[PDB]
Ligand binder design. Structure first.
Ligand code: NI
Length: 341
């Protein structure tokens, strides 16, 4: 049965609700982004209207074989009308194609659903600036003050500098980057760019990336692993055994692996700046865990909400324990008292 925080009141709409069969009273299903926890249940047999971004639509058609007639892509930053309700899709600064949704209800209520997001001050100058929001359904993934992390830019600078130095010192080193879903493409693309290489990957992963419009993609990615010194592997293979084996598969082209595991958060951020990060090493294999997040830090989230000043906040993450729920509600109270709303 569909939870309440996936239902938009005063509409026949749901958000990221495909794993519950036919939702009672749902006339249109919105999908914020192409991550499995959100799309789970879509397939070729789906025959209700799905509203999403252009990129998300491309992925629905090609990867899941959803039929074209049921896919309704909307342009960003554009007032559109769905079953008589004005809607706008806004960039969520999450993975490619990820959106937030603004709903303008017939009675005058305005609702923002963030989907998954990484709050940024650039959002303070989109269509949000111009009006009040009565209800915010908020991505609360990292809603606690221990979750502090660097900017994506600082993390990429660290990665590029590390990889460039390693391959310069040993031209026979291979760089590996882990992946488990779309998102975090900048990690591997920025590395390949500095080394003068393409990123080699499986045919299935190549086809996924080709679905995303990213300009100059024929230009940065390939299925020819032999001609590439940056390889993309499943995140599960980013460990000493998986990587020893990969190295075996390369037929003596390389004698060393430097691997990156972009993670959300790790407790080393509580004690260590980006510049201080060091690898785990075993033989000729080093693994760096880097804090590349596509979700708001605590402070990013706090600033977004104190700017927006919603009348009611509905959390969409960490809602399953009484202790988590209580903790988040206590922060929301603080934020409201400090900002004067
Ligand atoms: Ni996500």
């Amino acid at each position: 049965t569909c939870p309440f925080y996936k239902k938009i009141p005063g509409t026949g709409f749901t958000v990221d609700a495909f794993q519950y069969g036919v939702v009672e009273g749902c006339t249109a299903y919105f999908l914020t982004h192409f991550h499995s926890d959100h799309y789970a249940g879509l397939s070729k047999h789906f025959t209700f209207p799905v509203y999403c971004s252009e990129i998300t639509g491309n992925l629905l058609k090609n990867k899941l074989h959803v039929q074209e007639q049921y896919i309704h892509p909307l342009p960003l930053d554009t007032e559109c009308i769905v079953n008589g309700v004005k809607v706008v899709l806004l960039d969520a600064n999450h993975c490619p194609g990820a959106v937030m949704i603004l709903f303008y209800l017939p009675n005058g209520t305005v609702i923002l659903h963030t989907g998954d997001f990484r709050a940024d001050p650039s959002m303070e100058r989109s269509l949000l600036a111009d009006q009040k929001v009565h209800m915010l359904y908020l991505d609360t993934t990292y809603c606690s003050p221990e979750y502090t992390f660097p900017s994506q830019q600082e993390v990429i600078r660290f990665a590029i500098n590390t990889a460039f130095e390693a391959v310069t010192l040993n031209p026979h080193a291979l760089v590996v980057c882990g992946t488990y879903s779309i998102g975090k493409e900048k990690v591997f693309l920025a590395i390949a760019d500095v080394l003068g290489s393409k990123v080699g990957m499986s045919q299935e992963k190549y086809k996924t990336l080709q679905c995303l419009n990213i300009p100059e993609i024929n230009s940065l990615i390939t299925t020819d692993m032999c001609s590439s010194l940056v390889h993309l592997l499943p995140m599960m293979q980013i460990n000493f055994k998986g990587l020893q084996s990969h190295l075996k598969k390369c037929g003596g082209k390389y004698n060393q692996i430097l691997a990156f595991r972009p993670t959300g958060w790790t407790h080393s951020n509580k004690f260590t700046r980006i510049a201080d990060v060091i690898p785990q090493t075993k033989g000729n294999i080093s693994i760096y865990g880097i804090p590349y997040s596509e979700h708001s830090s605590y402070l990013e989230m706090k600033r977004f909400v104190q700017w927006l000043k919603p009348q009611k906040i509905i959390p969409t993450v960490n809602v399953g324990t009484w202790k988590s729920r209580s903790t988040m509600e206590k922060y929301f109270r603080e934020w409201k008292l400090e900002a004067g709303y």
